[PDB]
Amino acid sequence: QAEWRSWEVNKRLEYSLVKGITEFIEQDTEEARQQATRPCEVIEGPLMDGMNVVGDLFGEGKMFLPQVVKSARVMKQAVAYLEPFIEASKEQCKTNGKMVIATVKGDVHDIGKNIVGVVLQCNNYEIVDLGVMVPAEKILRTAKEVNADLIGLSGLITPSLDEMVNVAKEMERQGFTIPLLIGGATTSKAHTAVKIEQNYSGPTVYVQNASRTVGVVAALLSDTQRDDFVARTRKEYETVRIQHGRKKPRTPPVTLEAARDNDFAFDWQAYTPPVAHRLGVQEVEASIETLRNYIDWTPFFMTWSLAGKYPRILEDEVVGVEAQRLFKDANDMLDKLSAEKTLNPRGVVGLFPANRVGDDIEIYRDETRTHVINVSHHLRQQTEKTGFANYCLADFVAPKLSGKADYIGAFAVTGGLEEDALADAFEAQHDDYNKIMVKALADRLAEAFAEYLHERVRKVYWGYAPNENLSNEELIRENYQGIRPAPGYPACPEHTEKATIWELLEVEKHTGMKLTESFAMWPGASVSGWYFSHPDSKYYAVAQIQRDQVEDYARRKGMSVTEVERWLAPNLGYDAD
């Protein structure tokens, strides 16, 4: 009765792998397994005779990642069935190469890595994933214990770039020869070509996306290009170095002295800082239903590699259809989670009295302005300014020497602690779709809580806009007074400051969230930052900070001048080691 259920199980298998169907997969995988001598011919047969189809159609714009992930599911549920008949009839069976991929020790961003991960499992490459915040040691060990042909690391935070150079050294100090691919959006063909490739006498290549990966990995293993490639790359990474070496610099830096003097000019005498309708640290929660109306689906589609800016992306004559069903499944999931409460976004907010002092934000235990409960430290742009001031988030706060009782706030929210468990849940049932789906949503609900919270802060809590009324649109455009910078962003690059935010809020004590070693957060889908009210506070980039400030900062933090140089490596205005 089903026109497609009337074909050879080897052509319906290609169908199941294309139209993503696991309903008749176990039979369409067993039938071809019985019509097969040694159990693995199906693996290298109709499975790949279909994956190569999934790929070819993928590259012709006749498929998209969202679908390829549903295809990879059938391919894994098909292999999750032929695992036994190959455990008792071990034959290994050929692939296109094995590779150990993992998220640089300390970092949490993994989806971008899990995408490139399957994109290769669609080219018959075996990908022994390791996860996030994985120690460079475990990574190399795996490379050996599994005799991998390559190693791909992924990191999007600042500490990453440093923990990556570590692996390059270890591979070079332990005799490795397999290539070393650096991954991440933040990681550039520059940092890789200047601060990493030179620490490993082996192939160290960078890739922009999960699309280029397939191309690179290929000509990196091919016995007819592997040489033309490597040489071509090394000669290129040579250009980058000398290129940025010449542009080093174009805009001369400045002294922390002349910098602080040329600070955000503003007459605090005329102005009068808006008092906080409230003060203290209050735990806060919000149903998924409440947050759903704050979600920014733009990045959501942007994750599944779908060019578009919601909602117009739902129309787009290209992926409009896919963007829809994806958006459908997304919501359909949020529905079950919101009803079953199987996921509950949690968070905490706080408001304290504070004042600026040089480049720091003194935080008092109460209006008395006597005893300090902590001090938020902030850097200051250190390049030559023309017409503008070397901005520092400290400026936007009333200088202690003005009496103007100013205030500052902080927060830390998560799309729920159940992220991990849920992810592993689908992980077991071999379903990368919902696994990456829930992770993506957790991120959404997470950032959604950040807006929803900040709103109630601008309106109620802080109270400098109680009658403020905006639609999700205006919010994304940031149609409001004040900014909510967070540790890591160009405004406040120093990551260890997350410490302060976790201190002042007793976050783990009110939310459960935790800070690892590289000052990463938990669960993965979690955000935390500050709150500033001053109607002129804007997001800028600290840029390049010179020595004199690294020291002075290491002095205010009590951190070893060197250790500091590490956390702000990408921001250092010189070439330290």
- Residues forming the active site: 107, 109, 160
Among 100, 127, 157, 543, binds ligand B12 (CB under 6 A): 157
Residue 96 DSSP SS3: coil
Strands 204-206 and 180-183, bridge-based pairing: parallel
State yes or no: 186 annotated in a binding site: no
State yes or no: 107 annotated in a binding site: yes
State yes or no: 154 annotated in a binding site: yes
Among 529, 544, 550, 572, binds ligand B12 (CB under 6 A): 529
Residue 67 binds to ligand B12 (criterion: CB under 6 A): no
Sheet-wide strand order for 204-206: 126-129, 98-103, 150-154, 180-183, 204-206
State yes or no: 540 annotated in a binding site: yes
The residue among 25 and 446 lying less far from ligand B12, judged by its C-beta, is 446
Whether the Cβ atoms of residue 447 and residue 527 lie closer than 8 Å to each other: yes
Q: Write out the binding residues for ligand B12, residues 219-278 only, by CB under 6 A.
A: none
Measured over the CA atoms of residue 302, residue 304, residue 307 and residue 308, the dihedral's sign is negative
Among 199, 213, 381, 518, binds ligand B12 (CB under 6 A): 213
Q: How far is the CB of 103 from ligand B12 (least distance, A)?
A: 8
Whether the Cβ atoms of residue 521 and residue 469 lie closer than 8 Å to each other: no
Output the CA–CA distances (angstroms, integers) from residue 119 to 77, 123, 126, in the order listed: 17, 7, 11
Residue 572 binds to ligand B12 (criterion: CB under 6 A): no
Whether the Cβ atoms of residue 143 and residue 108 lie closer than 8 Å to each other: no
Q: How far is the CB of 265 from ligand B12 (least distance, A)?
A: 27
Q: Write out the binding residues for ligand B12, residues 352-411 only, by CB under 6 A.
A: none
Measured over the CA atoms of residue 126, residue 130, residue 132 and residue 133, the dihedral's sign is negative
Q: How far is the CB of 535 from ligand B12 (least distance, A)?
A: 23
State yes or no: 394 annotated in a binding site: no
Contact window for ligand B12 (CB under 6 A) among 48-56, 365-373, 440-448, 457-465: 440-448
* Residue keyed to tokens 């202690």: 400
Q: Residue 20 — left, alpha, or beta (φ > 0 → left; ψ -120 to 50 → alpha)?
A: left
Residue 103 DSSP SS3: strand
Q: How far is the CB of 198 from ligand B12 (least distance, A)?
A: 18
The residue among 121 and 158 lying less far from ligand B12, judged by its C-beta, is 158
Contact window for ligand B12 (CB under 6 A) among 77-85, 381-389, 465-473, 525-533: 525-533
Among 94, 173, 185, 272, binds ligand B12 (CB under 6 A): 185
DSSP for residue 313 = G
Burial of 135 (0-12, 13-18, 19+ CB in 10 A): middle
Q: How far is the CB of 484 from ligand B12 (least distance, A)?
A: 10
Among 30, 162, 362, 447, binds ligand B12 (CB under 6 A): 447
Whether the Cβ atoms of residue 410 and residue 501 lie closer than 8 Å to each other: yes
Please state, in angstroms and rounded to a whole number, the distance separating the CA atoms of residues 147 and 155.
23
Which of 29, 165, 60 is CA-nearest to residue 104?
165
Q: How far is the CB of 180 from ligand B12 (least distance, A)?
A: 9
Q: How far is the CB of 269 from ligand B12 (least distance, A)?
A: 34
Please state, in angstroms and rounded to a whole number, the distance separating the CA atoms of residues 326 and 321.
9
Q: How far is the CB of 429 from ligand B12 (least distance, A)?
A: 20
Residue 253 DSSP SS3: strand
State yes or no: 305 annotated in a binding site: no
Site string for ligand B12, 467-506 (x = CB under 6 A): -------------------xxxxx--x-------------
**Helix (H), strand (E), coil (C) string for 557-574:** HCCCHHHHHHHCHHHECC
Residue 16 DSSP SS3: helix
* Residue keyed to tokens 């900040």: 454
The residue among 273 and 485 lying less far from ligand B12, judged by its C-beta, is 485
Which of 214, 20, 216, 19 is CA-nearest to residue 115?
214
Please state, in angstroms and rounded to a whole number, the distance separating the CA atoms of residues 547 and 243.
23
DSSP 243-281: HHHHTS-SS-B--HHHHHHT-----TTT---PPPS--EE
Q: Write out the binding residues for ligand B12, residues 87-146 only, by CB under 6 A.
A: 101, 108-113, 115-116
The residue among 350 and 493 lying less far from ligand B12, judged by its C-beta, is 493
Here the tokens at position 14 are 């290609």
State yes or no: 484 annotated in a binding site: yes
Residue 154 binds to ligand B12 (criterion: CB under 6 A): yes
The residue among 130 and 351 lying less far from ligand B12, judged by its C-beta, is 130
Residue 419 binds to ligand B12 (criterion: CB under 6 A): no
Contact window for ligand B12 (CB under 6 A) among 72-80, 181-189, 270-278, 555-563: 181-189
Q: Write out the binding residues for ligand B12, residues 319-348 only, by CB under 6 A.
A: none
The residue among 48 and 445 lying less far from ligand B12, judged by its C-beta, is 445
Q: State which amino acid sits at residue 146.
A: V
Residue 549 binds to ligand B12 (criterion: CB under 6 A): no
State yes or no: 200 annotated in a binding site: no
Among 96, 186, 262, 290, binds ligand B12 (CB under 6 A): 186
Please state, in angstroms and rounded to a whole number, the distance separating the CA atoms of residues 7 and 546.
69
The residue among 55 and 487 lying less far from ligand B12, judged by its C-beta, is 487
Q: State which amino acid sits at residue 493.
A: P
State yes or no: 158 annotated in a binding site: yes
Residue 406 DSSP SS3: strand
The residue among 36 and 104 lying less far from ligand B12, judged by its C-beta, is 104
Other C-beta atoms closer than 10 Å to the C-beta of 463 total: 16
Residue 149 binds to ligand B12 (criterion: CB under 6 A): no
Question: Residue positions in the annotated binding site for methylcob(III)alamin?
Answer: 44, 106-110, 154, 158, 210
Positions in the binding site for ligand B12 (CB under 6 A): 101, 108-113, 115-116, 152, 154, 156-158, 181, 183-186, 207, 209-210, 213, 299, 303, 305, 439, 443, 446-447, 486-490, 493, 520-521, 524-529
Question: Residue positions in the annotated binding site for S-adenosyl-L-methionine?
Answer: 296, 484, 539-540
